[PDB]
Amino acid sequence: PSTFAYPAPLEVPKEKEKEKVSTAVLSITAKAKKKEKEKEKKEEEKMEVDEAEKKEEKEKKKEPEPNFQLLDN
Amino acid sequence: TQCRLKLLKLERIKDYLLMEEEFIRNQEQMKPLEEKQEEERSKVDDLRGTPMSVGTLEEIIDDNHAIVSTSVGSEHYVSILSFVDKDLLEPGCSVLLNHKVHAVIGVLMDDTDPLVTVMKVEKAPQETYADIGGLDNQIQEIKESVELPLTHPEYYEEMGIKPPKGVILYGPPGTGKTLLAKAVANQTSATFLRVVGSELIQKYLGDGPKLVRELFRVAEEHAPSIVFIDEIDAIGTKRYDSNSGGEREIQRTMLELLNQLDGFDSRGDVKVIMATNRIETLDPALIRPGRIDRKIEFPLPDEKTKKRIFQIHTSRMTLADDVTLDDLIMAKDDLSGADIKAICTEAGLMALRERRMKVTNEDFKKSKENVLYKKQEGTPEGLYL
């Protein structure tokens, strides 16, 4: 029952133009802030630091999109 | 030493942070949302075509029109089509022109010519006082005139003495004329302009004098700056002769340099360090005291001075520490500061020839002799004729 189903509502062209602008601001600011911040001393007996105050170094996110392999049947 | 090494740990972290931090601020996260900000970015794209031509702005008139010379074809009477105002503009600057309609889009670049690219060695040397092989007293004269009025006006105002517009270094050569200029230039942490005198000599008609005045203009935009005119005598009073296109050339480039430094008064716009390997046999037409005030003369090192040059040197070196520094100097006879440097370098190289790695007491003795011999053969020896 699930190999031929009702495909999602569309990405559309409209939303595609609109989104990039939004993604642009978040994207530079996150990367610029997150990569630069360290709170680590690597020549120390400690690995990083026992945590003094909270860090801003943080990590990224990944969301893919669902598709199943090449078939027409 | 320790301090110098430490500064590097901070600087290693600094490069990494600065490259990320640059990105969020410059734009594409600080993307123009402001009426003023957006208007300049959008408008220049629309007016601009590609190609463009560079020009240098020959004179401006106050009715919103100006006259420019473009690199290609003729000169143009251009309008100020939007953007920059009259005040912003000045003659002798390089401005950007659209080919479609030549107009001044602006400057904010402190010019841009192939000429300026050669002039800007802008990023400072690591060379600094007492990293030099020099005499203690001699560097401290260069600093007093050039550096000190900017750093502390306090001493100069209370005392009541007049600040100069440059200084002049002249030999006996092999005295570290150039080393001194680089030492002071790092300390100000102001942009260091450099040009060699021969570049300003050419067999083209009239090109030379534009460059000579140009040095002072580029520097003024960047200012404070120190302008290093390496071998001034070259444009000046040392020959290009009267039978190669020198006959016209030298007199014009020399004169052009001499009148602005002199002015009508000692202007005091930008400081200058001028290095010359002599003014000893050369002709008068060069800058005199009381525009650049202090003129610095170098000696030929005596026994007592040789202590100051040598102690600096013995530190990088080794095994001339074992033997007293005083005795070594005494033993050697009078020589110029480049010669003293040369003995010390040569000590390190001669050990390698001996089949030893590096300077020993023995290697140091032999190096003294070799340089001395070159000089003794070249010029008069001991006892009269």
Swiss-Prot record, chain A:
Modified residues (Phosphoserine): S27
Region of interest called Disordered, as start-end residue ranges on this chain: 32-73
Biased amino acid composition, Basic and acidic residues: 35-45, 52-65
Modified residue annotations for Phosphothreonine: T23
Transmembrane stretches, start-end: none
Superkingdom of the source species: Eukaryota
Subunit record text: Component of the 19S proteasome regulatory particle complex. The 26S proteasome consists of a 20S core particle (CP) and two 19S regulatory subunits (RP). The regulatory particle is made of a lid composed of 9 subunits, a base containing 6 ATPases and few additional components including PSMD1. Interacts with ADRM1. Interacts with ZFAND1.
Function recorded in the entry: Component of the 26S proteasome, a multiprotein complex involved in the ATP-dependent degradation of ubiquitinated proteins. This complex plays a key role in the maintenance of protein homeostasis by removing misfolded or damaged proteins, which could impair cellular functions, and by removing proteins whose functions are no longer required. Therefore, the proteasome participates in numerous cellular processes, including cell cycle progression, apoptosis, or DNA damage repair.
Similarity annotation: Belongs to the proteasome subunit S1 family.
Official protein name in the record: 26S proteasome non-ATPase regulatory subunit 1
Taxonomic source organism: Rattus norvegicus (Rat)
Gene: Psmd1
Curated annotation (Swiss-Prot), chain B:
Keywords: Acetylation, ATP-binding, Cytoplasm, Isopeptide bond, Lipoprotein, Membrane, Myristate, Nucleotide-binding, Nucleus, Phosphoprotein, Proteasome, Ubl conjugation
Biological-process GO terms, alphabetical: proteasome-mediated ubiquitin-dependent protein catabolic process
Membrane disposition: Lipid-anchor
UniProt key word Cell cycle: no
Name of this chain's protein: 26S proteasome regulatory subunit 4
A GO term from the CC aspect: proteasome regulatory particle
Phosphothreonine: residues carrying this PTM: T379
Post-translational modification N6-acetyllysine, affected residues: K203
Entry-annotated residues carrying Phosphotyrosine: Y384
Site of covalent link Glycyl lysine isopeptide (Lys-Gly) (interchain with G-Cter in ubiquitin): K182
Organism: Rattus norvegicus (Rat)
Family that this chain belongs to: Belongs to the AAA ATPase family.
One MF term in the entry's GO annotations: ATP binding
